[PDB]
Amino acid sequence: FFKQIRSDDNSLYSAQFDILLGTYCNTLNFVRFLELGLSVACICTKFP
Amino acid sequence: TGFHPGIAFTVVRQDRFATEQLLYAERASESYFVGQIQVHHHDAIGGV
């Protein structure tokens, strides 16, 4: 409870606020090994 | 020490009770002239 406004009513006219000016995320560059320049040295072969 | 020095006193005290009174007034028992609302202004803490 607060009555202290005896129609003296200051601080009733403030409108300061906070704003979120945006968000920024990144992405991961999924690298494929067989697209490199190194993959010429090994004979890759899957083997389950 | 409980000795009665041949003199007597008459005590007086005054009380105060809250009442509920019952007014009566006859018809047209008062002539009432009304003026004109005038407005004056002045400064105070914070506001006018």
Q: What is the least distance, in Å, from the CA of A19 to any CA of chain B?
A: 30
List residues of chain A with CB under 8 Å from any CB of chain B. 8-10
Q: What is the least distance, in Å, from the CA of B35 to any CA of chain A?
A: 27
Query: CB–CB of B45/A8 below 8 Å?
Result: yes
Cβ contacts (< 8 Å) between A10 and chain B: which residues? 46-47
Place of tokens 């004109």: B36
Query: CB–CB of B41/B48 below 8 Å?
Result: yes
Buried b (16+ CB within 10 A) or exposed e, B7-42: eeeeeeeeeeeeeeeeeeeeeeeeeeeeeeeeeeee
Q: How big is the A-B interface in CB pairs under 8 Å?
A: 7
Q: CA A13 → CA A5, A18, B6, B44, distances in Å?
A: 12, 16, 79, 18
